[PDB]
Design a protein around this ligand. Structure first.
Ligand SMILES: Cc1cc2nc3c(=O)[nH]c(=O)nc-3n(C[C@H](O)[C@H](O)[C@H](O)COP(=O)(O)O)c2cc1C
Ligand SMILES: Cc1cc2nc3c(=O)[nH]c(=O)nc-3n(C[C@H](O)[C@H](O)[C@H](O)COP(=O)(O)O)c2cc1C
Lengths: 216, 216
């Protein structure tokens, strides 16, 4: 039951460094990243999936200063995913999306492709020109991807912890993201929690429905 | 198989106006909204769940002019969820979160609660004071909730479609969100697609892993 998953998944505070994702699970988490939906299927993202010791250590460099409390999570987890957003929406990328959809057979007629291109252009330009906030818009799509991912790995029986407690400037420089047109937003270590994960047994806590929901 | 769900769920283009969620399903989608994770468990959100014809009509007011092509999805679906984010992070809310966590038994000592409070305050101020982007920070938590939600309803065998194509100013006015300290971000109609929902049969399309993923 997916609801049981939602009620039982938790942010792992300590991973068992000896437990690695199986080959199949490693392939599956990549599929989750890839198939998340996004506005106009813009997929304005890039992911760094670190599973080697050096790779994880490089990501862990971002857990400096007061963020050191997140260092071990990055080092001990099996796979560490760095969620990145594009820094600017370029036409090349927009054409890429529609050309891929065409290649995937989503358009039965040329008019179907044109309507899809027109729609994407509308939203892309609204953010790139009218509101000048495509950076924020794309980052929001990335966070949506994170939400999809956390529940997905949870449903797979895998543990993880979403992390905002890291220095993105440091992480960006470490992987030369800026030059590639990306910037890091969330780091998500994935693996299996150890018995020393105090958060594995604490009850989950959320404000009451009477406060967060309005029915009409 | 959550991966099969990710490969099969789709953005519903048409809903069967006669198929409603069961009472149990209605309770479950609300649980999904409530239990989504968030930075510091800040839960900077509110949700409008319209299930009555009048309720959906009010939300559909936002599907005006340019967005009229999204009106029927909002009217024919069983339940329509409007994801809202807080417009500013006030101390009052941060207090609510920590007090709820204490009530739920997440702290072993008063010192533990204070430590949790200070930590949350640190992240909160980083956005409210330093970066002056707490509005965007919270909106990102909402999108993450949206991501969690879409996969969840998909895993429930339910159909839904995320909608950015609506006028938030109109929606905000209609539900007096501004006054409540909230703003509408995404509308998600939930229900059962109709036989006319062509997007249910079109193949899914995403860019290749060789482009979006870097393994290290
Ligand atoms: C975007 C985001 C960033 C977060 N950052 C951190 C972090 O830096 N370190 C950490 O241990 N937990 C972090 N958390 C975990 C939150 O404290 C957690 O999601 C919340 O308290 C609810 O608990 P749950 O995830 O167990 O359901 C983050 C969560 C989100 C959604
Ligand atoms: C934030 C967001 C906003 C979206 N807005 C709309 C919309 O206004 N109308 C619509 O029909 N689809 C909308 N979509 C659906 C996208 O076109 C869709 O998610 C994407 O093309 C991938 O297809 P899939 O969801 O079927 O996997 C939206 C998706 C997201 C994630």
């Amino acid at each position: 039951d997916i609801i049981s998953v939602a009620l039982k998944r938790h942010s792992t505070k300590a991973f068992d460094a000896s437990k690695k994702l199986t080959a199949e699970e490693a392939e599956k988490i990549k599929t989750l990243l890839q198939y998340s939906p996004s506005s106009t299927n813009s997929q304005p993202w890039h992911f760094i999936v670190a599973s080697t010791e050096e790779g994880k250590a490089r990501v862990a460099k971002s857990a400096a200063g007061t963020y050191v409390f997140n260092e071990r999570k990055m080092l001990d987890a099996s796979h560490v995913v760095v969620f990145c957003a594009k820094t600017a929406m370029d036409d090349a990328w927009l054409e890429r999306v529609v050309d891929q959809e065409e290649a995937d057979g989503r358009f039965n007629t040329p008019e179907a492709k044109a309507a899809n291109h027109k729609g994407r252009t509308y939203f892309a330009d609204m953010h790139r020109v009218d509101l000048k906030d495509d950076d924020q818009w794309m980052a929001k799509q990335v966070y949506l991807n994170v939400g999809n991912f956390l529940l997905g790995v949870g449903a797979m029986g895998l543990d993880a912890v979403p992390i905002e407690g890291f220095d993105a400037a440091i992480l960006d420089e470490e992987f030369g993201l800026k030059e590639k047109g990306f910037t890091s937003l969330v780091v998500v270590p994935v693996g299996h929690h150890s018995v020393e994960d105090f958060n594995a047994t604490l009850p989950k806590s959320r404000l009451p429905l009477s406060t967060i929901v309005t029915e009409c």
